[PDB]
């Protein structure tokens, strides 16, 4: 059956790639993304952010919104070849908008520098480098090749120069989740050019397993701070869910080791097995604390790991209270339950696996 308040079955979402068609509700999300002049997020390459003003997206989170849209569009390209030209066009726009000062300008306003790419700031330039790669996989266009080579060399050189494996975001803030994106961006560059930038990944997976994970609980600590050597002593569900999802595309064995322990630690099954919600940290019964993204990031992880049961449970918790409706063949939510809501449900519904995106066949 179709549980109440849902738009399509878990069977339907997982069958999209095989049926070579997106579900009607994913098509209605692409319509929200592309249809109305000026105010749709993928209307033009311009430095126009009307779509994010209307959703009340905080400035600091727009970079994550654009990136999550981009990762979803790369899966749409793989699902339906008739939509691959459209997905490529949207990715062109995603890259253009990602480079606008509205998106990266927090870096300058906080006093960290005038150039968002030259040093640090992996939370921005990791996502940008992955988007450059996914654009070229999807389209075969060399439009951003020069910028892509420049940013990839910056990421490689900065990893090589650091005593810890990886790159900080704000100075003296190290986040595994933001590093995972940077490392995946090196895999994609290597797939495009036959280079071996991804070689640095082994050292990184060794490093994050020493100080930054609780292996019994299958959960990463919130953050690391190289100057003091401090690890914030709380484990984080959203941090772990995101990291495991991306690492599965580079070292599947790593994510398969920790995933069942991650679920025991954080996932609460309820309503006689029909629903699930995710605790953000230990020592609490409360779901979706902190940034409120544990359930939505776990939905993406469930998709990456092929876990239909947990996917169905999480989507039954997340989607119905958001009261989705289709108006003029376009998807809207009356009560989005978190930041980045339509972005993450879109991405989770279409996600083909970061592994599959790496191996994407040419046009």
**Residue of 231, 269, 322, 356 interacting with its own copies (CB under 8 A):** 231
Residue found under tokens 């878990």: 10
As a whole number of angstroms, the distance between CA 329 and CA 301 comes to 29
**Residue of 54, 85, 199, 203 interacting with its own copies (CB under 8 A):** 85
Two tokens at 66? 């654009």
Task: Mark the segment that binds its own copies (CB under 8 A) among 9-17, 125-133, 186-194, 284-292.
Answer: 284-292
Residue 200: alpha-carbon gap to chain centroid: 21
User: Do residues 308 and 299 touch, judged by C-beta distance below 8 A?
Assistant: no
Could you say whether residue 291 binds its own copies (CB under 8 A)?
yes
Q: Which of 230, 233, 203 is nearest to 220 (CA)?
A: 233
**307 an active-site residue?**
no
**Residue of 75, 126, 330, 344 interacting with its own copies (CB under 8 A):** 330
**Contacts to its own copies from residues 132-171, by CB under 8 A:** 139, 141, 143, 170-171
CA distances from 100 to 62, 92, 328, 339 (A): 11, 13, 31, 21
Could you say whether residue 21 binds its own copies (CB under 8 A)?
no
* 265 CB-near residues (< 8 Å, 6+ apart): 217, 218, 219, 235, 237, 282
Smallest distance from its own copies to CB 99, Å? 10
Two tokens at 328? 């003029």
Two tokens at 126? 């990791």
**Residue of 36, 54, 199, 203 interacting with its own copies (CB under 8 A):** 36
Q: Which of 278, 342, 338 is nearest to 307 (CA)?
A: 278
Smallest distance from its own copies to CB 332, Å? 11
As a whole number of angstroms, the distance between CA 116 and CA 123 comes to 10
Could you say whether residue 233 binds its own copies (CB under 8 A)?
yes
Could you say whether residue 227 binds its own copies (CB under 8 A)?
yes
Residue 328: alpha-carbon gap to chain centroid: 28
As a whole number of angstroms, the distance between CA 142 and CA 198 comes to 21
User: Do residues 122 and 113 touch, judged by C-beta distance below 8 A?
Assistant: no
Please report which helix (H) or strand (E) contains residue 52, including its range: helix 50-55
Smallest distance from its own copies to CB 256, Å? 28
The single residue of 12, 25, 37, 288 carrying the catalytic annotation is 37
Could you say whether residue 60 binds its own copies (CB under 8 A)?
yes
Smallest distance from its own copies to CB 268, Å? 13
Residue found under tokens 């090196």: 186
Could you say whether residue 172 binds its own copies (CB under 8 A)?
yes
Smallest distance from its own copies to CB 87, Å? 8
Task: Mark the segment that binds its own copies (CB under 8 A) among 45-53, 68-76, 146-154, 180-188.
Answer: 45-53
Return the beta strands (E) in the chain as ranges.
213-214, 219-220, 224-225, 230-231, 267-270, 275-278, 324-327, 330-333
| Residues 242-281, mask of contacts with its own copies (x by CB under 8 A) | -------------------------------------xxx
**Residue of 3, 14, 21, 112 interacting with its own copies (CB under 8 A):** 112
**Residue of 9, 14, 21, 86 interacting with its own copies (CB under 8 A):** 86
* Residues forming the site for its own copies (CB under 8 A): 24, 27, 31, 34-38, 43-48, 58, 60, 82-83, 85-86, 88-89, 92, 100, 106, 109-112, 139, 141, 143, 170-173, 222, 225, 227-234, 279-284, 286, 289-291, 326-330
Active site residue ranges: 37
């Amino acid at each position: 059956e179709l549980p109440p308040g849902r738009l399509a079955t878990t069977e339907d979402y997982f069958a999209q790639q095989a049926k070579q068609a997106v579900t009607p509700d994913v098509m209605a999300q692409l319509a929200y993304m592309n249809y109305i002049d000026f105010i749709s997020p993928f209307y033009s390459r311009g430095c126009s952010f009307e779509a994010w003003e209307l959703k009340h997206t905080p400035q600091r989170v727009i970079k994550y919104s654009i990136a999550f849209y981009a990762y979803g569009l790369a899966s749409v390209a793989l699902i339906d070849p008739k939509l691959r030209a459209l997905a490529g066009h949207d990715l062109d726009i995603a890259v253009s908008k990602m480079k606008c000062k509205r998106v990266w300008g927090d870096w300058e306003e906080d006093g960290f520098g005038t150039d968002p790419i030259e040093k640090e700031n992996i939370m921005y330039k990791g996502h940008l480098n992955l988007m450059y790669g996914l654009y070229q996989l999807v389209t075969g266009s060399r439009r951003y090749e020069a910028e892509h080579a420049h940013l990839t060399r910056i990421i490689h050189d900065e990893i090589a120069a650091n005593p810890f494996a990886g790159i900080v975001s704000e100075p003296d803030n190290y986040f595994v989740q933001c590093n995972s994106v940077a490392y995946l961006s090196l895999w994609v560059y290597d797939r495009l050019h036959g280079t071996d930038y991804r070689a640095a990944t082994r050292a990184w997976l060794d490093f994050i397993q020493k100080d930054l994970i609780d292996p019994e609980r299958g959960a990463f600590y919130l953050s690391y701070h190289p100057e003091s050597g401090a690890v914030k002593p709380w484990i984080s569900a959203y941090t772990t869910a995101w990291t495991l999802a991306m690492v599965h595309g580079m070292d599947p064995a790593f994510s398969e080791r920790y995933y069942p322990r991650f679920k025991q630690t954080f996932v609460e099954v309820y309503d006689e097995g029909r629903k699930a919600r995710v605790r953000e940290t230990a020592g609490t019964d409360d779901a979706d604390g902190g940034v409120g993204l544990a359930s939505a990031f776990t939905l993406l992880l469930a998709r990456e790991m092929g876990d239909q049961q947990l996917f169905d449970q999480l989507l039954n918790h997340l989607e119905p209270p958001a009261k989705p409706s289709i108006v003029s063949a376009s998807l809207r939510y009356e009560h989005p339950g978190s930041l980045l809501f339509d972005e993450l449900l879109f991405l989770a519904k279409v996600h083909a696996g970061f592994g599959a995106l790496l191996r994407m066949p040419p046009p």
